[PDB]
A = this chain, B = another copy of it.
């Protein structure tokens, strides 16, 4: 089993053409609605389905059957993205194709910078046979704009864009440590397109670049893809009754 080495999911993300990726928050979206949504993602040509949230409780009992219901509705890989908790590490369930593991390089708490990875692997394989574990996508995760919620929870400080000094240090780490992916996120604002370009030009060719946060239009998706993002994530735009119209606009 690849585990922390590159596997099937990373290969699919590297070779698929760039595009939008819908993110289903499984603790806010009822499983029946997630299944209806998942059936549409497949038709649009998205590369994967991400299940992600800042908050979670009773993870294993909720997520194992939630992941199975989504997998029955779409052939796309199902990737989990959640923060770790001291004493447990990152949450995991069998059936997920991959876990996106964020190393929060801008956090003031070394647990969220990377020690969460050590706690997670110490606990591996735990309850799940090694042969059935999801693959791990080792990711540099950076936050942009004022965000006291993630700051309070994970210790993140917004990345300073007054110079490229801080991002240049993250680029050196992303390259030398052989991270698989970089995830640029803004909870309350927008990751700057020029930061996306700086990362695309500074990363190796096989390092996958995700951008998300407040993407609500196809124009925003296009601008980020033109700036070099491999995938543009969006969750909140579809957390409403008229999600089918919003999805068609974002994917158009």
Contacts and interface: CB of A to CB of B under 8 A. Distances in A.
A118 B115 contact: no
A123 to B, nearest CB: 9
Given A117-B118, A118-B121, A110 B178 contact: yes
What is the count of identical protomers in the complex?
Answer: 2
A158 to B, nearest CB: 15
A68 B178 CA distance: 38
B4 A122 contact: yes
B110 A177 contact: yes
Contacts of A173: 173
Interface residues of A, number: 19
A119 interface: yes
A169 B117 CA distance: 22
Interface string A2-24: 01100000000000000000000
Interface in A105-130: 105, 110, 113-115, 117-119, 121-122, 124
Which of A117, A119, A176 is the most central at the interface, judged by chain B CB atoms within 10 Å of its CB?
A176
A44 to B, nearest CB: 34
B119 A4 contact: yes
A82 B119 CA distance: 22
Contacts of A244: none
Contacts of A105: 176
A40 to B, nearest CB: 36
B178 A113 contact: yes
Contacts of A124: 121-122
Nearest to A173: B173
Contacts of A149: none
Interface of A: 3-4, 105, 110, 113-115, 117-119, 121-122, 124, 169, 172-173, 176-178
24 contacts: A3-B118, A3-B122, A4-B115, A4-B118, A4-B119, A4-B122, A105-B176, A110-B176, A110-B177, A110-B178, A113-B176, A113-B177, A114-B177, A115-B178, A117-B118, A118-B118, A118-B121, A121-B121, A121-B122, A121-B124, A122-B124, A169-B169, A169-B172, A173-B173
